[PDB]
Amino acid sequence: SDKSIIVIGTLSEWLASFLGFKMLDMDKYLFRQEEAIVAKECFTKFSKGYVLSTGGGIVEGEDARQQLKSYADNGGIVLHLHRDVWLRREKWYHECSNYHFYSSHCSTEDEFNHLRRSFVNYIKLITGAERPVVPAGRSAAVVLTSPDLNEVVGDLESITIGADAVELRVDLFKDTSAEFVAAQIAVIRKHADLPIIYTVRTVSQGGKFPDENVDELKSLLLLGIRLGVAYVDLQLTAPNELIEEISSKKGFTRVIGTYQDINGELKWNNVEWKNKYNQGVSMNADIVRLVGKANSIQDNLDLENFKKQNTLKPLIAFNLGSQGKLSQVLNGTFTPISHKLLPNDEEFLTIGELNQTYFDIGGFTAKKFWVIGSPIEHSRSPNLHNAGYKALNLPYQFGRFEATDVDVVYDNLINKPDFGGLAITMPLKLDIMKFATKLSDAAETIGAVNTLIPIEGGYFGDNTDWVGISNSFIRAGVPPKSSSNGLVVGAGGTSRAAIYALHQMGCAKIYLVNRTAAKLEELVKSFPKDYNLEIVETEQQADKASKVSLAVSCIPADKPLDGEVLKKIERILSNGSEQSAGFKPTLLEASYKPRVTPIMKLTEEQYKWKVIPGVEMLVNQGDRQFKLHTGFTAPYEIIHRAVVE
Amino acid sequence: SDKSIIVIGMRTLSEWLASFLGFKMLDMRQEEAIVAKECFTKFSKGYVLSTGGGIVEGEDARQQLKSYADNGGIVLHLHLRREKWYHECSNYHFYSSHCSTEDEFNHLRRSFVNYIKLITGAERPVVPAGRSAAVVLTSPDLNEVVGDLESITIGADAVELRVDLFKDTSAEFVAAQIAVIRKHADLPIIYTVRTVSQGGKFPDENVDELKSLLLLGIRLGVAYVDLQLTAPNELIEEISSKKGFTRVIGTYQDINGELKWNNVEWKNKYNQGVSMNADIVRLVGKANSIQDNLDLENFKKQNTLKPLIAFNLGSQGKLSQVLNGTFTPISHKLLPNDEEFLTIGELNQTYFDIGGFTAKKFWVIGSPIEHSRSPNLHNAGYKALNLPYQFGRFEATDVDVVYDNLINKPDFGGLAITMPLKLDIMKFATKLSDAAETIGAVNTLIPIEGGYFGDNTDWVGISNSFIRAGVPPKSSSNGLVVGAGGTSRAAIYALHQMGCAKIYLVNRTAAKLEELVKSFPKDYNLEIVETEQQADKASKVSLAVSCIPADKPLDGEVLKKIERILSNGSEQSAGFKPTLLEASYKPRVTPIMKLTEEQYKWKVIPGVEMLVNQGDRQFKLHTGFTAPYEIIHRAVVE
């Protein structure tokens, strides 16, 4: 988190704009003898904040190769962006670098979004930013059991619905080489963004990997560490020179420790299950997985008493077979699921059946959510959430209620027993904080609430419009923590949530342009001092506005461009059309009703800025509203089809 | 139990009661005052004393009836100026009403047998050891839902009458609503008078009408009287000392939901069930989370002396109703389900999705299997109960293709063996029932622990076809097996355990005739009839069975034997009409069905009734569930 990341092999400076780093290309810094005298200094003196991209043939000769491995063994990160001599130079990229990422090419823009969403999560892992935490409540983990994911490459977004992770059964591939499994991980990252469970399941535990190949099993699990998977999967019956070899150089990849009862005769009260749990605590495993086989329904209730007595480490525990479906329904962390377009052998339920049986035994209640506001017929929130409840087979409904005061929505909507949450689109955003007991940090500094879920001791309240603007920039190329400044054209509306969104993306000074300074200074006194709200009022400042790259137009686009507001906005886009530090400088407009607004035309072909429309704010604030209401991540391919078509 | 039954009432069920117990009968002012005394003490042990209708007209003559009550007698009323003198001088009542259909006649004379098995005290219904359910009839008046009450009680092994929510809680109304359930449902009645502190509409401040309501449950002969546990202790010790043979369920409910299933209040309520000697103890909580269900299965395994109906409530306690074994409350679409109880489809659908059941496959095996009508019977019962099973056919001639294609598979559920393979499947049953040894054929092979169980349900189809047409289960008549066909040995065995003192074989030809006596025990007395003069000594024959095929119209030596046997029919009067049962399915008009009905006035029964009742006990053996009878009868008769 402190040192540098040597990149060997357009993605290099995007990594620089994530941690606040700056690129140092060694091609411009400048045959094989002067390449060794350069590798001495900058690999040690520029060991603070530089993403030291190298040339092509740096690995020629033993001069820098023993220098790269000296820094790779001293805690440093040598990273390889695999593109696609290449049979002779790539074989020194693979033995020098300790971390590998496959930057495969993307045609559609949804694949190019996933590869920057899976490279934030990759860099958050190998650097030490955030280890992949165990999910809080109920989570799933889809068991991708296809021998070639390119046969099911189109429907991968429909497979990973409800899943918090994917379970890459490595032994079930065509060939378990070093190169085929590294190419299948690039498919669940250009078509998904979930963490990967790297299961190499031996033949003594129910898979297709031979037990005598210990050296080919050590190499496979050491490769998954290099590719930055989030959950490596050792077995508790593995030899000690392979449990200790993996757990001494995992770095940050969490270890699930597994032992399945494939014969199916140990009930869940033996000392055989206390030892294998205690082997997982002794090897410092983040999750212990213990799989049984049910011969009756008592072994599912025998498992509910085993998990009570053993809560030291997180435990996955379920009973395989047709008589162990209850233990798969009642299991919290990483319940394995399957799909109809995948091969299925262990009879795991789908997400439509895991959520139906959890409703038929009373885990989900038939809750009712509402959206409130005075012009509520022109809304697309019941279109968005109901198509998310249908995809996950949740027993929820989302309806409308026209309201003007917050006293009526207490009686007709909130005081019901089946009430599950609200969503607010009115000046009721200011007056529904009367009900919120616990407010987030977003709701107090903005002074608006568009989500009202019930919790213990009252009700929770959060503004997700700052997610609705920050997420819309991240899905259009912007790093989540860049180093540019901001802009907000116009005040009023969702402008108080635009200023809170831009600072949390890492903007230094936020420049506000609007036709009335009386409502411009109101945003100045109502916000903290780390935000640096500098109103622009003269045209000389709009030339010297520093590093403006993320504008958010909150202006009502029924009145066109005022002119007295416009001569700065034509000038703001002038001096920043060439700075592209990790991202092309982009713009967002926070209203939905016209499909293209006056400001968006004037900035996309006249000044070369990327425009994101208002419907991409309705999804991303409805994505985060889906997570607070239900607890699941919404299917993005269906909430984006329901809000548009 | 060997004592008399003094039948009181107005001016059929008296001598049918005599024919059931094997007990004799004696029909019974100043000349009546002397003669009514000695027939109560020297005709005490044995005669069901049918007394008159004006016997209660006297003052002292009502007292000699009440002398029989407190000593331990079974004085009994069969149902305006004397109803206040009939219903007080009887420690058990019973209600006979006018019935329209033969199915309506059937349920009255079937729910009388389990009534008279209860109030005499022979075989009480002992707390069903499988996985039972109970329909919660929540209707104010059961004549509204009366056309569908056979569809309401489907898959339920008991009926939960909630007496509080009747529109009238009077003694005449509850005895009318029990009258309209024994006409359509031959099920045990759980008599629940629920008070307002536990979720009911009966008040708590009127204790006197609550005690006198549970006493109507003892006297109308219901099976389970509910007593509450937060009740007055004079009521608990009155419906546990005067309960008779009606069992006691003790309930406590948490209407608030302030107790979890680790509090000592649930332990004290189980010990109130153990100390009051209740048969089943009942504990209904309320689930505010799904953990409250798994806190219940750790209570159920720490408290196992008396059986426990333990289940939470609310929409978060559906696991506690699904995982419950004894008497899960179920409801219907046509009933006012207010505590959101499951239906019979939703209880089995949820038990399958959590792994209680498995998708099994049952088969019927035999060589001419193209027209069997056995898969149509069972598939009409899996559909009504929503069990996840299928029934199919497998043409077989040898028994080894059954073992390697059907039996050894992990989805094997059972077999229903037909004619050319019944003898061969006996080698697979590691536990044969007593009927399988005596008959010599097995038509049911269900898997058990370490092998398979082999039963012959052909005798219980020949038997239950008679009991469904008015013949008592233990009457005193004699029988006749006409033929020596494929079902001939089950019909000999079914005739003895019906209670015939004598079975008379009469065959087409005498080749396969004397072998039946060397292959049957001497206790099952089989007198072979030889000549026509021997038809005159054949006495009390009113339970005949024909299994001669309907290819030959009856003539020769055989016709003259049967022609003088059915002539001694209705005049013997063993409490029923003389009955013949044709064993062949397809020839609906058998010539022997004509010559016993259109000439000698017997009640003849076609072979569609035997094919159903053979499959009804196979359905109980294959699934553990009582089959819906109208749905499986209206699957063969098409």
Numbering used by the authors:
A (entry chain B): 857 to 865, 873 to 893, 913 to 966, 990 to 1550
B (entry chain A): 866 to 876, 882 to 898, 923 to 973, 1001 to 1559
Please share text taken word for word from the publication where this structure appeared.
These two models (Aro1DHQS-EPSPS and Aro1SK-DHQase-DHSD) were obtained by docking and refining against cryo-EM maps X-ray crystallographic models described earlier. Within these particles, there was further structural heterogeneity, due to the Aro1SK-DHQase-DHSD fragment tilting in various conformations relative to the Aro1DHQS domain. There are additional contacts between the Aro1DHQase domains in the Aro1 dimer that may also contribute to dimerization.
In Fungi and Apicomplexa, the second to the sixth steps of the shikimate pathway are supported by five enzymatic domains combined in a single protein known as Aro1 or AroM. Aro1 forms a flexible dimer allowing relative autonomy of enzymatic function of the individual domains. Our activity and in cellulo data suggest that only four of Aro1’s enzymatic domains are functional and essential for viability of C. albicans, whereas the 3-dehydroquinate dehydratase (DHQase) domain is inactive because of active site substitutions.
